[PDB]
Ligand binder design. Structure first.
Ligand SMILES: Cc1ncc(COP(=O)(O)O)c(C[NH2+]CCCC[C@H](N)C(=O)O)c1O
Ligand SMILES: Cc1ncc(COP(=O)(O)O)c(C[NH2+]CCCC[C@H](N)C(=O)O)c1O
Lengths: 435, 435
């Protein structure tokens, strides 16, 4: 079966709503996807929805003959890492701890899938709250609710469908828990310190009210440090620092969902490191290839927590061993080539270019924003946003929509300034056409 | 980091409650796991909890130099198959359809993880019921409950934690929906046709009562065709045929969870093919490597179902491309070497040997049972069962517990009769020690 027949074959069995190209697995490389049908090269600011750190076929992986042998050994089989340990697995875990570890969060747990990473973070919190309640003479039936934000996206699974609230298409007609949801006080243009502080104060009031009206029943607060799917909405560190204090006052865990922000994109291992707020638990995925949680801080105060008691958390495989081997090589490249720092520098460059765009097109390029390489801007209407994405597609630049009017950039950490310039050049060409 | 240091390294970050061995990825093969620490070979009747169809490093995979190149191409990267299609993906899908497909169930959907496969089956049913309700003048807020069995295991995720009911450790302190649960009328020794029929009639009465007391609100009935984790509990085809009629009478979908039974273990592609009951949806995983659902039958009667409307179901990756490439090669081996038929024949052999054991040890080897290679027996007490597993471990045979008193066999489809004899020889040696 042939590149020009891929869509026909898949269309017999599935809804085929993805891209019109067929990925060439061999010829794609770095910031470029190759369409196997035409041979056209596409500039990639999409990176499999922000899940590729180094882009396609990175040289450090492709040229490493020893790694080839390690990867092949892992790829031929699929052990249940839950039950059966290997050297390949242990090397991944120690390098994950070294490169991305936080000394306050020593407990690691791996699983396949971002939604399930978040769910295990939730399960840790539910167990923790119930046991903390029990230890202090409170009914252990209490501790089952999750405080969360409007505009959140945490996944499409049983628990995360009660949290995710972006597009109705995602959650409509699926049963949900009635969990408390508060306004998201994200930064918007033309609001100064005082106006921001007032916005935050109102979310915080809603948060406090939830805690007081559902006593001992809220196990945790979950947030994305920067909301991705909801529209690259950024929050001041002050908001989360206040939430941190409020969580502690009501004995609730703070969980950061770093599935989209994590693994270097904002310029640090984790976005929370720049906000200077310490979470009790972090859910990770996408760029990490294997998904999972890191936990500690207050979690350890309950001695029989989910990380200390056998069989409270599990899955058949405990993550994909092939993903672990690939991820450990990727982490070694990040560490050796200083890619977090490269993301800070190139992220400053991308951001500066978006600021220039805003100046040249004041009524059209709205709210340029970003942290590291996680950058975005918005258009006046969703029709404009949609049209700009199509115009870029015609020019062989792949970017992603978010929310109602946002265009987001998700370049690989290895993107060059010339590649950023090419993406920006395409946007400048397309904009007069959309206006 | 060295085989003898694997447990120490992992133990700094995780609960290390798995096996005392370290898997040698290279030297393991067929029905044998190799401990990298000692070089001792272990007879494998566990197969990464029934997730390996051909065992370790099968020759058809290891010796195939063209497949090596295809696997390597897939393993180096991890595309989002949700968005970006490839030839590798299309070849997997057409071979899955050819080898395991059912002409009544043409809609395929893939995802990482068995619990999420079941959840997507549930989501399809919730959407279907709500839309079917709406189309017939019934409130579309109705259709949110799942009828299911006692002793069921469907996963450890948000929706499946409301269904799974085996050991309290799995579900305790996690929030749940109040979904209707009925007795499981499984076959037990010393019950004849009439007594079985009475048992079934009572479950069916409970099922009917649930439907009548929760009108238009039960979207589906979910079952394992043979309950695995709950204790290899088998059901007569009559029970499911009656459930099939009852589902149709109340406009509810029937879903079979074949994550553990599927992909040839019982001697057919799917266990439901031997029960002669047509499901509307099948959840699969484990041996398939990639997980997912097949759907059709009544699903198609709602034209805007979840398989026809973009973005109702999704994940970042849409399954792991490396798993798809491996699975397609495994399916080709199954088809070429007649491994379903080999499972029927060797399954009859294993079963006959367990019958012999029951005769030689009448008060100790209870209820020998099986379908194909999915076989089991029970012991008088859980202390006896636990001790037998330890005694087998000392003799380098790996088997799994289930329920309170069951020992289950999960050999690879490629197991030989000499390997079955070796496992049986070990059980005969260990039994006098446990008594
Ligand atoms: C912030 C955040 N949390 C969890 C997830 C879920 O990850 P996974 O898809 O289950 O592996 C995500 C995923 N976000 C977007 C990429 C996939 C496409 C799209 N979100 C979808 O509609 O499913 C996340 O960003
Ligand atoms: C019948 C059945 N349905 C769903 C699942 C869930 O699959 P996954 O683990 O999410 O990939 C299973 C899995 N059953 C057992 C193997 C793993 C160990 C154990 N069940 C556990 O405690 O998690 C299944 O059998």
């Amino acid at each position: 079966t042939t590149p020009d027949r891929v869509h026909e074959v898949l269309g017999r069995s599935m809804l085929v709503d993805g891209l019109d190209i067929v990925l060439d697995l061999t010829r794609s490389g770095g910031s470029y996807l190759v369409d196997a049908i035409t041979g056209r090269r596409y500039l990639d600011m999409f990176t499999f929805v922000a899940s590729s750190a180094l882009g396609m076929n990175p040289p450090a992986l492709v040229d490493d003959r020893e790694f080839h042998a390690e990867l092949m050994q892992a790829a031929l089989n699929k052990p249940s890492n839950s039950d059966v340990y290997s050297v390949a697995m242990a090397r991944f875990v120690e390098t994950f701890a070294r490169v991305l570890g936080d000394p306050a969060l020593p407990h690691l747990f791996f699983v396949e899938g971002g939604a399930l990473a978040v769910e295990n973070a939730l399960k840790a919190a539910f167990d923790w709250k119930s046991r903390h309640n029990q230890a202090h003479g409170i009914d252990p039936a209490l501790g089952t609710q999750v405080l969360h934000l409007r505009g959140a996206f945490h996944g499409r699974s049983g628990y995360t469908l009660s949290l995710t609230n972006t597009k109705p298409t995602i959650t409509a007609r699926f049963p949900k828990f009635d969990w408390p949801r508060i306004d998201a006080p994200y930064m918007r243009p033309g609001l100064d310190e005082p106006a921001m502080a007032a916005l935050e104060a109102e979310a915080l009031r809603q948060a406090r009210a939830a805690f007081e009206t559902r006593p001992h029943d809220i196990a945790c607060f979950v947030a994305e440090p920067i909301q991705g799917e909801g529209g690259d909405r950024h929050f001041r560190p002050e908001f989360f620092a206040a939430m941190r204090e409020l969580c502690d006052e009501f004995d609730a865990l703070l969980i950061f969902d770093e599935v989209q922000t994590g693994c270097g994109l904002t310029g640090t291992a984790w976005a929370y490191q720049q906000l200077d707020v310490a979470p009790d638990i972090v859910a990770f995925g996408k760029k990490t290839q294997v998904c999972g949680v890191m936990a500690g801080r207050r979690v350890d105060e309950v001695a029989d927590n989910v990380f200390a008691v056998p069989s409270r958390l599990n899955s058949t495989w405990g993550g994909n061993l092939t993903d672990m081997v690939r991820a450990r090589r990727i982490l070694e490249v990040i560490e050796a080539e200083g890619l977090f720092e490269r993301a800070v520098q190139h992220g400053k460059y991308l951001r500066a270019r978006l600021d220039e765009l805003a100046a040249d097109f004041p009524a059209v390029v709205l709210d340029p924003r970003g942290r590291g390489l996680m950058c975005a801007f918005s258009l006046p209407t969703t029709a404009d946003r949609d049209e700009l994405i199509r115009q870029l597609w015609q020019r062989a630049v792949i970017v992603l929509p978010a929310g109602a009017d946002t265009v987001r950039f998700r370049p690989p950490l290895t993107v060059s300034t010339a590649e950023i310039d090419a993406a920006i050049a395409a946007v400048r060409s397309a904009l007069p056409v959309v206006t």
